[PDB]
Symmetry: C3
Subunit: 198 residues, 3 copies
């Protein structure tokens, strides 16, 4: 009440909390993720703020894709060692994460009834698509394709729920040139899914 209806990363973390590129090193961006319980659905709200030079310089290429993989255990806790996001989610505490135990965490998860694992005849049901935007140096909006796959494919036995968010573009010519590129920020993408029961 009402803070326990949100599970999130908090706002603008002081350091990179996410490793999106497998070639990184170490955390290479800030993943901002907010999940809000909305009746039978979750309202999910996600974007990235680039930190590493290699990540930011993706905007100099015409053909790119990168994926944040989020894996959760049987009670709705982020598995940080397996996931792109390396800091656990918690509830709302002002502009930050709370620090205690989670209330009803499993109820934030993508339902396995709506989004099954390993069922080929139903695999189309596991997908979400939309569009977000990169604000370019000339302040035009560069469209970025976003896809989300819910559950479908488990990494291993520990991972009871999965959210995989893939940003991509394939264009005639690129957001930015070497000297104009600054930070790869995506506009927030909001998507909805049927939630697992508490």
């Amino acid at each position: 009440d009402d803070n326990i209806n949100t599970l999130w990363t908090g706002v603008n973390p002081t350091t990179a909390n996410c490793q999106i590129m497998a070639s990184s090193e170490s955390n290479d961006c800030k993943l901002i993720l907010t999940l809000v319980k909305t009746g039978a659905l979750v309202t999910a709200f996600v974007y990235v703020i680039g930190v590493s030079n290699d990540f930011n310089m993706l905007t100099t290429h015409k053909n790119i894709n990168f994926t944040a993989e989020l894996f959760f255990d049987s009670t709705g806790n982020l598995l940080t060692s397996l996931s792109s996001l390396k800091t656990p989610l918690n509830h709302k505490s002002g502009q930050n994460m709370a620090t205690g135990a989670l209330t009803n965490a499993k109820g934030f998860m993508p339902s396995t009834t709506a989004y099954p694992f390993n069922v080929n005849s139903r695999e189309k049901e596991n997908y979400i698509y939309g569009t977000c935007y990169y604000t370019a140096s000339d302040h035009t909006a560069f469209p970025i394709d976003i896809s989300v796959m819910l559950n479908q494919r488990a990494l291993n036995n520990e991972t009871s729920y999965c959210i995989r968010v893939t940003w991509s573009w394939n264009t005639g010519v690129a957001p930015e040139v070497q000297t104009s590129a600054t930070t790869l920020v995506t506009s927030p993408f909001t998507f909805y899914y049927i939630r697992e029961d508490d």
Copy 2:
């Protein structure tokens, strides 16, 4: 009881609950519809999972359009004999519909103040548009146009509210060929409207 803040079809019903082709001899798809009260608005979340051969084979045509028509009486109850959806909505009970009386069903309906009946000067206000996606056998995303009309024209004196949802496409190439077609699934489309009062 947050369960009463949802009015929905339940998740993945056993059998087809919806007859969407007026060429069908019975229910031909699963209509998944979730309405959630969200302040002054309803958040509405809708897609189809095809069941009948003839419906699924629509994916082999390059030009298609089909519509789910939902009509409600003065107290917010689906009129199944009038509507594409042939099973009444009810509140959240886990992944399923509850089975009792409805609490404040009228409050899920599209406002007749925001979305009037038979006012030609305000007709433009009755329309919502967006895009959803079919996930093709080769895992590309095929864009489908979606339009919603709220109220505007009644079917008869019994219908106090209407939701009409039209999916359509017209491209050079069809989503599938005969040999690659399986099930016509649309990605969930979420739209918002100003809700009638309880």
Copy 3:
């Protein structure tokens, strides 16, 4: 009382409540705006219904943009003298605005933690984009680009929070001709942002 979870214009005001075009005169349209508290986010739902002839005739041009500027003071109250919207927001009261004092009004505002003022290195984070639609005379849907900038740039000392919504299009040829143009109505655009704390 769920009514206090909404801050809005009410539905279809009797008279124009907004002056969008700087060449106007007086109020030239109805801004419909609904803000709903949704956990750590606000769900924002916005469109215009044109009233003045010059505003409605914008649809006869191929290259147009207009902006609703909404400025709020330090406790979340609309500054009507500074803003396009000239009538204060209030809570839900049926299809209308309530008339009493606001509960918690600052909590509807765009967070200055997520959406800072005057920080160049973070300016990309201040932007939201999407698409809405004008329903043309031939009942085709004409796409309109929408951008929202949150905070970023204060008008003056009074304006603690800013929401600026820009509608635009730049097309080969134009919604509408002099004799087909009627009312410029935009389909509702829903967007989300991280909210300031109560």
